Amino acid sequence: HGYVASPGSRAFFGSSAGGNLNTNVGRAQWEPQSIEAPKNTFITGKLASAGVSGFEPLDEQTATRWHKTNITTGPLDITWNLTAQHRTASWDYYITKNGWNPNQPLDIKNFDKIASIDGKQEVPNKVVKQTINIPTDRKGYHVIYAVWGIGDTVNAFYQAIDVNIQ
C-alpha cells in the first residue's frame, strides 16, 4: 500500500494530507494508498480507480474536475509514500500523449510509457524518490499514470496524477 505524494496524486489530493484539493473522491479521502489491482489492469474509464470498489468517483474525467500540480517539461521528481512496504518488481510511468482529450474516459492507449525502474525484488523504504523525464511535446493538462508493481504478488498499485505543464 502506497500513493504518490509529490506531485500529489488524484487520490492523495482527496485526503487531508493532500489538502482536500480534490473533493468527492470516495475511499481516497481516507486511504489513497489502497488502489490495488492485478498487474496490467488497464480498463478504459477505470484507470484512476483501477476498477476498485469505493474508488469509482476518481474516474470522472473533465478538463476542470481535478486539481493539477504546475510542473515543467524535463526532469520531474516523483515521491511515493508507502504505508505498507512490499517487495517490489517494478515502477512504471506513463503520460498522456500530446493531443489527448481531457473530457473523455482515460484509455491507456492514449498514453506513452516514459520511465521504467526495476525494483530488483527488494523492499523499498517508506519514502521512495525517483526522477522521470517529462517529454517536451507535452503542454497544458496531462495525466501521469504511476504503477508500483509488487514483487511477491500478482498485483500493483495505480496512481493517476493530474499535472499542468508550462
| Site for Cu ion, rule CB under 5 A | 1, 84
Query: Cβ of 148: how many Cβ atoms within 10 Å?
Result: 26
Least separation, in Å, of the C-beta of 86 and Cu ion? 5
CB of 6 to Cu ion, least distance (A): 20
Q: What secondary structure does DSSP assign to 17-45, as a single string?
A: TTTT-S---GGGGT-GGG-EEETT---TT
142 known ligand binder: no
CB of 66 or CB of 157, closer to Cu ion: 157
Residue 1 in marked binding region: yes
Residue 84 vs 99, nearer CB to Cu ion = 84
Minimal distance in Å, beta carbon 2 to Cu ion?
7
Which residues 6+ apart lie within 8 Å of 116 measured at CB? Answer: 90, 91, 92, 93
Shortest-Cβ-distance residue relative to Cu ion: 1
CA separation for the pair 31, 35 (Å, rounded): 8
Which residue lies nearer to Cu ion by CB, 61 or 81? 81
Residues forming a β-bridge with 134? 74
Residues annotated within a binding site for Cu cation:
1, 86
Residues annotated within a binding site:
1, 86
